[PDB]
Amino acid sequence: STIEEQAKTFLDKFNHEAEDLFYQSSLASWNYNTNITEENVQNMNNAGDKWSAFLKEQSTLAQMYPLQEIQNLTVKLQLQALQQNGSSVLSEDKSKRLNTILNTMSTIYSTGKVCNPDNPQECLLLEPGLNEIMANSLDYNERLWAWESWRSEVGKQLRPLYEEYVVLKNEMARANHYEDYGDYWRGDYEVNGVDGYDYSRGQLIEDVEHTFEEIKPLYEHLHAYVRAKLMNAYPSYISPIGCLPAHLLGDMWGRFWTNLYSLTVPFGQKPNIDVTDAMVDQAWDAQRIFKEAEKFFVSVGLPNMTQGFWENSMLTDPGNVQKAVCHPTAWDLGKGDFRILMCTKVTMDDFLTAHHEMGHIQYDMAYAAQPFLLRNGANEGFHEAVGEIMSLSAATPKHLKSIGLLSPDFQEDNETEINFLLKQALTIVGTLPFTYMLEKWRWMVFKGEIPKDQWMKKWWEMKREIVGVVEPVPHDETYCDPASLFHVSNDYSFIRYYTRTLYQFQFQEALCQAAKHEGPLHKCDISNSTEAGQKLFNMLRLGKSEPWTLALENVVGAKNMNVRPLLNYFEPLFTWLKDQNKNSFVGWSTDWSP
Amino acid sequence: NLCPFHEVFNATTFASVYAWNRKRISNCVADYSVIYNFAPFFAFKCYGVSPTKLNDLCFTNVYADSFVIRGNEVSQIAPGQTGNIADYNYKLPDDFTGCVIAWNSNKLDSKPSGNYNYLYRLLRKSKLKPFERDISTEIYQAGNKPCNGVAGPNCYSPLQSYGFRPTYGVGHQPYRVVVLSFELLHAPATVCGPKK
Ligand SMILES: *[C@@H]1O[C@H](CO)[C@@H](O)[C@H](O)[C@H]1NC(C)=O
Ligand SMILES: *[C@@H]1O[C@H](CO)[C@@H](O)[C@H](O)[C@H]1NC(C)=O
Ligand SMILES: *[C@@H]1O[C@H](CO)[C@@H](O)[C@H](O)[C@H]1NC(C)=O
Ligand SMILES: *[C@@H]1O[C@H](CO)[C@@H](O)[C@H](O)[C@H]1NC(C)=O
């Protein structure tokens, strides 16, 4: 009985009560999310405590089979996933302190309410109020007030906890045989053992920087166009030669530029594409939406879904009788149970999100044959990229005309193409510099080579050079501006949104080439292409067994992120921008002084 | 004389796959039409015997093994398969003149709290042999150190449970399987089909 054989029999008695306990916990979470009561909260607490205790016990009984004495690769990956100490390396007091820090930060961010104007009677909260008044605001003074009000109260509470949180996380990562918490996070895009298909945790930084260097000129042109469009609407607020203000990007943190479309749309006289009217006058419901999504998937070639999916998934809100969060997510409860939880309205955006979550479900069903610890995407961007492939494909005018929402009388022109491409670039390209900036700042902070007394100083000097966003007012060191973000405050990796953007366009170009499609990449339809479906499924059914480097090559032919699929996707928009904004300055000045 | 072809198919409970129930049937009229009463039959493979010519032959003995497995483990109930059921729980010979019948039982079996009464063996020292039954629950020692009885690390009990919740998929739902294995020993046949 070799150590590898012992490892194979442990990870076969794990993969069996893990799956059972994970199904129990997932069912508890699902029934809570569909029915918010106190019994459901207690059931989640019990199931999660049992699952966590089982995971901890299984990890301590796995620390036995040494990795250097194992020659297999699947067993090696399973034991690597199971042997992660996590937060157990810290002392008891330090671990409880870190847990309290995380809980307090999450509660402060979720319950954060700014009441600066007038008396504290009038205060708004995140989803309807603050998001509504930041999304659609035409007042520079009001936008400045809201932005500086959140950045002041929330950041001043976050920073004293944030510094000690960073110290604790760095200590835990160092005890985990890593270099820092940034290295611990980057250790997900790591392949060690496979010849020809391998990766390093610094190679991720190098590749991300190189890809950003490649994408930069398109971002500069888009930024110049956005600045030119914003100056006309906002006189004397944006200098013709300077950078772009922080509070003017629709979102509170300027993550997405999608909401900056009313002041940016070039062809206002030309109406945008929208199928809501025909979709609502054709008597379409959530059942028909998901049936048409599954029709698209089976036309592509992927298998149809289980009968229990329809009878168990919650697709419509059951009135106000019971309370249920309707955030769209795809549930993989375990033993053959796939469910979709979303409040489906009859809208184009809800149709697209249904396609996105249905692609997530298809990915989940693809690798259901893999062992429990290998039932995930190859890296943490593969799932979102796979879903976004179908989300992009289902929104094409050709697919809409074939489906029936778009009348044949509508024609396709370069004007509508440019409109759609500009909206897509505002959604997608506009967030890549911000994501790279945020993750670079977090990596540098966790590295510790930079000092601590100029965190905000370096944050704002990196915002200007990388994103082109200038601080509207000076900020001292008492602020903790990056901690105002959901992922930064709640300890979430953010490079996944940069990686998924490249991966999705890689996949789209590969599948459009495999579908024998001729023409622009943005007018592509993977539907009715069994070859494209099979090519996608080849990578889709691998799960986490094969390295992401090989999984990428199995569908694309490359071995790392490539900007070129993005650039050929956005080439018509790039040419239009270059031809249009030639009379205006491109880029942001480095000599700006407020 | 009508022997329990109905009773083996229509039973309140079915034995686990690791310890299956085998019923020896003899001194009978065939009356195979009783089997076809159940409509939802998920599989009616008939290795070695035509599925319409059963009511013409005579066999010395007929064995009706019955057990409960998953939906995705029904494919392993066949001559020459491999997995965890076909080599540690229920192996059937390469020739296997007989029929395999399986239908879904997500209503009779299964329970929202978890039907843990149906167990299988996930670990055994050696592969099973055609029509062998291993009931012993000793502790499997997986390496280099005696378990010395009930034990925890590198030890590991052998029988694992299924759980069978009714919200499971189709390949994870309980599937009652009845396997008919006709024996053709060179003895006067006691089971025959009716004929005028
Ligand atoms: C949802 O919760 C309510 C709250 O009492 C209760 O009727 C039951 O637990 C659940 N009902 C349904 C229909 O899910
Ligand atoms: C690792 O073990 C599995 C057991 O199912 C086997 O399929 C696989 O081929 C092994 N790896 C290698 C590289 O042989
Ligand atoms: C799935 O789609 C196929 C189309 O090939 C259809 O025949 C089948 O009935 C569908 N099943 C369900 C459960 O929708
Ligand atoms: C796919 O093919 C079917 C049948 O040929 C057709 O009805 C449908 O409109 C096609 N869809 C697309 C997007 O080409």
Q: Is the CB of A72 under 6 A from ligand 2?
A: yes
Contacts of B161 in chain A (CB under 8 A): 20
Neighbouring residues of A539: CB distance < 8 A, sequence distance ≥ 6? A378, A551, A552, A554, A555
A140 annotated as a binding-site residue? no
Encoded tokens for A534: 């099979």
Are A531 and A223 in contact by the 8 Å Cβ rule? The answer is: no
Q: Rounded distance, CA A530 to CA B15, Å?
A: 44
Q: Rounded distance, CA A161 to CA A164, Å?
A: 6
Active-site annotation holds for A357: yes
Neighbouring residues of A185: CB distance < 8 A, sequence distance ≥ 6? A493, A495
Residue ranges of the alpha helices (H) in A129-202?
A: 131-135, 140-175, 181-186
Per DSSP, the residues of A319-372 read TTSS------EEEE-SSS-EEEE----SSHHHHHHHHHHHHHHHHHHHTTTS-G
Residue whose CA is closest, atom 2 of ligand 4?
A528
What is the residue range of B141's domain? 5-192
Residue whose CA is closest, atom 7 of ligand 3?
A304
Domain ranges of chain A: 3-82
Q: List all residues whose CB is within 6 A of at least one atom of ligand 1.
A: A 35, 37, 322
φ/ψ of A517, rounded to 5, equals -95, 130
Q: Rounded distance, CA B158 to CA A62, Å?
A: 19
Nearest to B136 by CA among B25, B19, B56, B31: B19
Q: Is the CB of A530 under 6 A from ligand 2?
A: no
Terminal-to-terminal C-alpha distance of chain B: 16
Residue whose CA is closest, atom 12 of ligand 2?
A72
Are A199 and A191 in contact by the 8 Å Cβ rule? The answer is: yes
Cα-to-centroid distance, A399 and ligand 4 (Å): 9
Q: What is the resolution of this structure in A?
A: 3.1
Q: Is the CB of A298 under 6 A from ligand 3?
A: yes
The Cβ of residue A413 has, within 10 Å, a number of other Cβ atoms equal to: 10
Are A123 and A113 in contact by the 8 Å Cβ rule? The answer is: yes
Nearest to A324 by CA among A26, A30, A35, A28: A35
CA torsion sign, B40 to B71 to B76 to B184?
negative
Neighbouring residues of A243: CB distance < 8 A, sequence distance ≥ 6? A464, A468, A469, A470, A588, A589, A592
Encoded tokens for B50: 């035509």
What ligand 2 atom has the least distance to the C-alpha of A75? 1
Encoded tokens for A310: 């329809």
Cα-to-centroid distance, A530 and ligand 3 (Å): 16
What ligand 3 atom has the least distance to the C-alpha of A306? 13
Contacts of B154 in chain A (CB under 8 A): 6, 10, 64
Helix (H) or strand (E) holding A253: none
Total domains in the fold of chain B = 1
Determination method here? cryo-EM
Contacts of A308 in chain B (CB under 8 A): 167-170
* Closest chain B residue by Cα to residue A312: B167
Are A493 and A452 in contact by the 8 Å Cβ rule? The answer is: no
Are B57 and B7 in contact by the 8 Å Cβ rule? The answer is: no
Residue A227: Cβ-neighbour burial (10 angstroms; 0-12, 13-18, 19+): buried
Cα-to-centroid distance, A394 and ligand 3 (Å): 20
Q: Rounded distance, CA B3 to CA B31, Å?
A: 9
Q: Rounded distance, CA A48 to CA A58, Å?
A: 15
Neighbouring residues of A296: CB distance < 8 A, sequence distance ≥ 6? A355, A390, A393, A394, A399, A403, A527
Q: Is the CB of A529 under 6 A from ligand 4?
A: no
Cβ of A9 and B171 within 8 Å?
A: no
Distance from CA of A335 to the nearest CA of B (A): 6
What ligand 4 atom has the least distance to the C-alpha of A299? 1
Residue whose CA is closest, atom 7 of ligand 4?
A402
CATH number, residue B127: 3.30.70.1840
Q: Is the CB of A194 under 6 A from ligand 2?
A: no
